[PDB]
Design an enzyme around this catalytic site. Structure first.
Site, PDB file in Angstrom:
ATOM      1  N   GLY A 160       0.611  -1.296   0.045  1.00  0.00           N
ATOM      2  CA  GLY A 160       0.161   0.038   0.181  1.00  0.00           C
ATOM      3  C   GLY A 160       0.877   1.205   0.130  1.00  0.00           C
TER       4      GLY A 160
ATOM      5  CB  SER B 142       4.505  -3.871  -1.060  1.00  0.00           C
ATOM      6  OG  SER B 142       4.417  -2.729  -0.794  1.00  0.00           O
ATOM      7  CG  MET B 143       4.807  -0.395   1.974  1.00  0.00           C
ATOM      8  SD  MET B 143       6.475   0.139   2.330  1.00  0.00           S
ATOM      9  CE  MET B 143       6.116   0.974   4.206  1.00  0.00           C
TER      10      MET B 143
ATOM     11  CG  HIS C 156       9.804  -6.882  -6.235  1.00  0.00           C
ATOM     12  ND1 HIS C 156      10.598  -6.195  -7.069  1.00  0.00           N
ATOM     13  CD2 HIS C 156       8.753  -6.983  -7.184  1.00  0.00           C
ATOM     14  CE1 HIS C 156      10.162  -5.514  -8.156  1.00  0.00           C
ATOM     15  NE2 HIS C 156       8.665  -6.161  -8.093  1.00  0.00           N
TER      16      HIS C 156
ATOM     17  CG  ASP D 284       8.316  -9.224  -9.747  1.00  0.00           C
ATOM     18  OD1 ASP D 284       7.713  -9.574  -8.675  1.00  0.00           O
ATOM     19  OD2 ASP D 284       7.876  -9.088 -10.777  1.00  0.00           O
TER      20      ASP D 284
END
Ligand SMILES: Cn1c2c(c(=O)n(Cc3ccc(Cl)cc3)c1=O)CN(Cc1cccc(C#N)c1)CC2
Ligand SMILES: Cn1c2c(c(=O)n(Cc3ccc(Cl)cc3)c1=O)CN(Cc1cccc(C#N)c1)CC2
Ligand SMILES: Cn1c2c(c(=O)n(Cc3ccc(Cl)cc3)c1=O)CN(Cc1cccc(C#N)c1)CC2
Ligand SMILES: Cn1c2c(c(=O)n(Cc3ccc(Cl)cc3)c1=O)CN(Cc1cccc(C#N)c1)CC2
Ligand SMILES: Cn1c2c(c(=O)n(Cc3ccc(Cl)cc3)c1=O)CN(Cc1cccc(C#N)c1)CC2
Ligand SMILES: Cn1c2c(c(=O)n(Cc3ccc(Cl)cc3)c1=O)CN(Cc1cccc(C#N)c1)CC2
Ligand SMILES: Cn1c2c(c(=O)n(Cc3ccc(Cl)cc3)c1=O)CN(Cc1cccc(C#N)c1)CC2
Ligand SMILES: Cn1c2c(c(=O)n(Cc3ccc(Cl)cc3)c1=O)CN(Cc1cccc(C#N)c1)CC2
Ligand SMILES: Cn1c2c(c(=O)n(Cc3ccc(Cl)cc3)c1=O)CN(Cc1cccc(C#N)c1)CC2
Lengths: 179, 178, 181, 182, 177, 182, 181, 178, 179
Positions: free
Chosen positions: F62, F91-92, F116, F161
């Site tokens: 996000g 992500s976060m 990533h 990735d």
């Protein structure tokens, strides 16, 4: 709107039809089954004008449908004409594959292009990995790299400079001016 | 739609092309790149020594597509006169400064901005990579030092044609033809 | 549908207007309308750099940068330019109308002319750039109307319209006329 | 589909109409409709400076300034203008209808005519209150001019929210003839 | 309208949860997962030996959302009775087959499918990782081999409750109690 | 429908979770999710300045600044924070996951973990290029801090990735335990 | 879903924050957010005109007129005000942050602070009104940061962000802190 | 949503009403008119002598709905303190000036405009009729002559609280409570 | 959001429910079958509290469905309570009809209201003229004007001042303050 140009006795074409006169084929924008149909139609037509006269493929694309890109690739290997590929703007995902599939020693890129063999992210899972193991083999074929090298290079979400892609095997010459 | 001129008849934009004039109207994308490059290579094959006049009135656009037009400019051998009308911002100012030195023009009341306003989703280092290419290209055609480009490309402001001429983006500021 | 007139040759009616050196600035003004007008301005000039061009204007305004480019081209080209206001000429439309060759700026009797800017650029812009546009408009209006900066500045604050006679008295227009003289 | 006729040349039916000096005013009147009609009006004048122009109006109204541009062009040109009303001529449609040349303002029997301005869009930008009535008094003057009615009579009639038959539109000064046959 | 039932008054679904029933209904996503997990952990707090009942009428959903529910089912200590109503396909049947052995039931007209109909867009190797995980979880709970799992999971068809009992998705098929 | 339980009082199942000092981080992380989580974090600290807080993460990422506000609040408060990873933490989501207290960063067996950063939205307004990497080096530092990995290792890993299993996420320093049972 | 905390009484968590004199300025700022903030500012002041209020800010900006009203209320009320920046404070959000009681303006370590105005009012407005807003912003930033008009004017032209340490050095912030001191 | 205060518990807007405060937030329509008038009559029946504080932060709205609130103001007998925060434009400035004389306030950095920016489709004379009512009402509460109102209501500009106080729209310009 | 008010033992209503305590009924906004249902429900309820205690109808409306307005009108004439109608803001089309249908001598308007009996412009044609001849009769009934006068007055697309409408028969008093 597409402009009109005049030839010389006299006849006038639209400027895009005039590039096909010079055996130039544009692969601009994302790739789908219609771009594949247009490109294959022009690639099979220019071979009818001459089996050995080179064809020029301009590639400025971010990628597209994998099967539609393989379709353009399989027609590239089929026809007898040599193909000079030119990378202008960018060539990512399926675009860099058509770029790397030109005749050896005729794959070019202008100085400021961006090259990506990493694939940006309905069929079953095993059919998707079937597709990637094909793209692994095509990229290995034309770059002369190993399946180990191609697999890890496609893992890195990043772009290559023209000089990088040349010394990786994707393209051959980075021109700035006509020789 | 486009009016029709009579000389054989073209529309007024094909007639503009017959005068070796290439328009860069509005936002720049891969279709604008494809159409401009097609005229650029067409104009060179007709004569690699007769200049090419390129009209710029654009708010910017896709960085790669603008770089695509920039490299075709640098590729072809013709002298190239770039003209700024209305405005030339972001990618537009780069093509404006990428003209043949001594032949970059602007009309009086136009605006010029190199501040890049803030084709697929891109990682952070690639946006920095593209920002760095703009840094080099700007510093090259403006003769400015690189440290002076990055500072100027960051003031969110416009330059008058006089200002942009001082900076080295363009050369002449014409009100009428002298 | 645009009809066809047959002269022999057969043009659409808007193309036939260009055969009489008429350029229509109709509707709002964006960069497409600017690029189209400039194309006919640079074309009509090469047909004759001294035969006058006629600029029909019926516009509420448009993009300031797209409008100033039309103005700059009008000042550039060598041709005298007759401006004509039918219906209305507001915001940047009046700026093109007031920027005709002095003594050749016309309006039909029932037109409405406004120089007050309602509400401008293809991109969102800082507050100092919005006023740099406005100070350029002040200079152009003061130049062509021969009015002072004090009068142009307070006139554009009047959210009102001008009759063709008021606009002629203010300096935007030269000749209100109802029939061919 | 616009049909194609043959006169040798072959136009569409509407270009064929323009070759008869017929300019249609079909439907709502906006800026693009105005410049389209005005272009035909000046064209038909250059072809002949005194041959009449026939102008068919079947319009519910539209942008006042756009219709005022058409009205001003009729007043500009030299030619006799024969206005015809089929279907209806409401709002600015009846202004052009009355703006025909006195004597040759016609209508067909089963049409309707309204000078009451319904509250197309009124103006090309949202304008101040004093501007809205500046147009309205401009309309008051133009109506009373071609009807030779008093401004007191135009104001009351335009207030009543109703149409008029061709015979009413005749007795008021809007038009001149109500034809059924040639 | 969700009705009320009665010295207290719950909504009918809140009344179901005191009977230690959990409803995996409709498609499965992170919201459905977070709602199911909050009930699985709460019910184990009331008692880690009292069984929990999972009604499943689901057509599938996000894999990582479903694996979170399955991971929580393994975490909690209670015996879990999975019940298949209407249908249970994709992640829904994997939740059904993950119940306590001998306590996975199905109504006689239900339809079960382990074939997966074709949060972030992801690579091809991450989807195959997902598939290998659904392979091994199915092989774990249906006491079938990975040859039998991979093969059957790629026939595009439904099973009957008796068929699913033959394969090992469930243990029992009740018509009445 | 959010179920209602009974402890006499009766909350919903999520307020009942908060009474167990459990703060869910479900799904994408935005500004409203941030202030919601931060409010629970400061509340559970006032109730006890050293009783642990359990924080469930099932998030794809996000808004970076929104997640940075949550990360800064975990760093602010005094309590031990027990981060749990079910489903995925991409992500976060993995930044907060690694931002747990060293020793009690957990995961369930069939989860996935990705550092990533996929190219929710990245920033709350469209920002300049130098700002995008200012965040990225901030992420580089925060990751390498809680993994005790070199900045050279964080940069290469975040480039690839791909997801990581709980066992990979352990050998890299992201989390501490991979539990199957209590 | 907003959870419930039980104290006895049972509030939702945002209501319970107000029991500790905390006002959240989260997300963009319109007149609704302004009216909500001012309501808690005027309410918390009547509970105690000298107990400090705490203003959590995590905002990209918003309407200038809606933001200035919040600022004007902060200057009005008697209470000292501790501002706190989490996540970000851009455009008008930083103006509220910089407008805390001097010595009580905080930021968590990983925040981003921008005073450059991106791109403002509920109605389209003339160019001179857009700059009157900007000159009011210049005065407020010069007042609270104690910087000059020359520095505020050129700082807002930098389309960039500031670290909590830069912002403390510039005058927007007083104390970057990572733990309860 | 709205926070909850504890005194019995209201939300913060019912608690604001308990302090005899009526909010006029944002655009004005018939629903805003209905809700404001309902609080206005409710506050008078509780006491026709205790003042009523009315907070105005609005860009205008439907002229009739604003006139509806204006007439309820003039009807009720309480002293009325009007407060301008953020802005009060169009119908908002009218209610602002319609406060009890000597009790019309504004915060420092707010804006005030009487220029009317340009419930059913309305004829030309009725828009002039409504414009004329605004002329009379403005000239009455500002003590300005009618010719001075129509000129000022036409400059498309804002006034600072100092300017609007000179004009007679408001009375005090408070930075803190004196 | 609708605020809450407290009464006095103690109970709290929303402010709109509190106006119904004072026998006030709001007819705000356009009129349809739901506004008609709400208004009739409150008009039949206040009659249950007292057959003779007056009811107050606040009307700030531009019009609405004719049959839904007649429905509110027929309930007005049915109930025994006197009805003081107040015109605030505006009362056009069906709104001015409810305004004019109050108890004679109790129809009011505040100074700045706008009053319109002209009807701003699927059923067959004769059913529409059936509706207007009803509205002609109701407006004539309560204004004490003739069918000639009402018909022509509804032709003029324009509004009336409160003083105009009072001296036409629509309302009775134009108050500025409580007497
Ligand atoms: C009948 N035929 C066929 C081919 C051909 O090349 N030409 C000569 C030709 C083609 C187009 C034009 Cl405009 C003028 C002359 C022809 O006549 C090639 N086909 C095989 C093929 C190979 C690669 C891609 C595709 C596709 N998709 C199809 C077989 C049939
Ligand atoms: C086959 N060929 C090629 C070129 C050329 O200039 N001409 C002459 C020509 C061109 C257009 C026309 Cl209408 C008529 C004649 C030609 O015939 C130039 N290409 C290299 C190149 C250079 C710069 C940008 C791109 C792109 N993207 C590509 C190589 C092929
Ligand atoms: C090459 N060239 C150039 C110009 C010109 O006027 N003509 C003659 C011409 C033009 C169009 C056509 Cl259809 C036929 C003949 C020409 O040939 C004028 N340019 C400068 C200029 C001046 C004013 C506005 C803009 C814009 N935007 C640009 C320079 C180049
Ligand atoms: C250059 N010129 C001009 C006019 C004219 O009538 N004709 C002859 C002509 C016209 C169209 C065509 Cl297709 C062929 C021949 C011409 O050549 C009339 N203008 C004045 C005018 C009068 C009424 C309305 C507008 C507008 N809006 C403008 C001045 C210029
Ligand atoms: C603090 N805590 C923790 C757990 C627990 O089970 N209980 C008892 C409890 C739970 C809910 C309620 Cl309503 C009442 C009592 C507790 O109190 C279990 N967590 C680990 C965990 C296990 C399985 C799935 C997820 C997810 N996603 C997370 C760790 C913390
Ligand atoms: C007034 N105040 C303040 C804090 C606190 O922790 N508590 C105790 C408290 C908190 C919530 C509740 Cl529900 C009940 C009691 C308090 O009362 C902490 N703030 C600093 C801070 C730290 C980390 C993130 C943010 C944000 N964004 C802000 C300062 C004010
Ligand atoms: C009547 N009144 C007034 C004020 C006040 O502070 N309090 C105490 C109060 C307020 C809310 C609550 Cl919930 C409980 C108690 C009061 O009672 C302050 N107003 C002036 C003012 C000052 C700053 C911003 C705005 C705005 N926008 C308005 C004047 C009236
Ligand atoms: C029945 N009635 C009436 C009025 C009044 O003020 N009160 C006391 C009252 C009001 C509300 C509440 Cl919550 C509690 C007590 C009452 O009881 C005032 N009306 C006249 C009026 C004046 C101004 C605007 C409008 C509107 N639109 C209407 C007459 C009826
Ligand atoms: C059963 N009944 C009936 C009526 C009545 O007035 N009351 C007393 C009552 C009504 C509501 C409430 Cl809340 C409390 C007490 C009652 O009880 C009136 N109906 C006739 C009627 C007249 C006018 C309009 C409508 C409509 N639509 C219906 C007949 C039935």
């Amino acid at each position: 709107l597409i402009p009109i140009v005049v030839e010389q006795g006299e006849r006038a074409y639209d400027i895009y039809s005039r590039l096909l006169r010079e055996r130039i084929v544009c692969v601009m924008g994302p790739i789908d089954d219609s771009v594949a149909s247009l490109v294959i139609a022009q690639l099979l037509f220019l071979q009818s004008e001459s089996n050995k006269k080179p064809i020029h493929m301009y590639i400025n694309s971010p990628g597209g449908v994998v099967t539609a890109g393989l379709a353009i690739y399989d027609t590239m290997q089929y026809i007898l004409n040599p193909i000079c590929t030119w990378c202008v703007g960018q060539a990512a995902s399926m675009g860099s594959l058509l770029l790397a599939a030109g005749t050896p020693g005729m794959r070019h890129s202008l100085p400021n292009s961006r090259i990506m063999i990493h694939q940006p992210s309905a069929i079953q899972a095993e059919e998707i990995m079937k597709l990637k193991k094909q793209l692994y083999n095509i990229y290995a074929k034309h770059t002369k790299q190993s399946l180990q090298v191609i697999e890890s290079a496609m893992e890195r979400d990043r772009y290559m400079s023209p000089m990088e892609a040349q010394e990786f095997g994707i393209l051959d010459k980075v021109l700035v001016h006509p020789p």
